[PDB]
Each structure stands twice: as structure tokens, then as C-alpha cells.
Design a protein around this ligand. Structure first.
Ligand SMILES: [Zn+2]
Length: 47
């Protein structure tokens, strides 16, 4: 559900060096790369 769900939530696992990182942190620590994410402002069909 919403609270307590099966699966690691929060921390984001890196792909470049394949090393775990802190949620708050935006970039990696081992490779110092840019965390995979999207741009600000949701997208969709609107007028
Ligand atoms: Zn990394």
C-alpha cells in the first residue's frame, strides 16, 4: 500500500558504478554521476 510496502524505497541505486546512494543526494558518491530522473513539471495532454 502507501505505508510500508514490499520493496526498497528512498535510496536510489546508481547504474554507472552500480553503487547505492542517499535519497536526498542528487548525484552519486562513488562515480559522482547524475541520478536518473525527470524534468520539473508533470507532462500530459492539456490546453
Ligand atoms: Zn555511481
Amino acid at each position: 500500500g502507501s505505508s510500508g510496502s514490499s520493496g526498497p524505497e528512498g535510496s536510489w541505486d546508481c547504474e554507472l558504478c552500480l553503487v547505492q546512494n542517499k535519497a536526498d543526494s542528487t548525484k552519486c558518491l562513488a562515480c559522482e554521476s547524475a541520478k536518473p530522473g525527470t524534468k520539473s513539471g508533470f507532462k500530459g495532454f492539456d490546453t
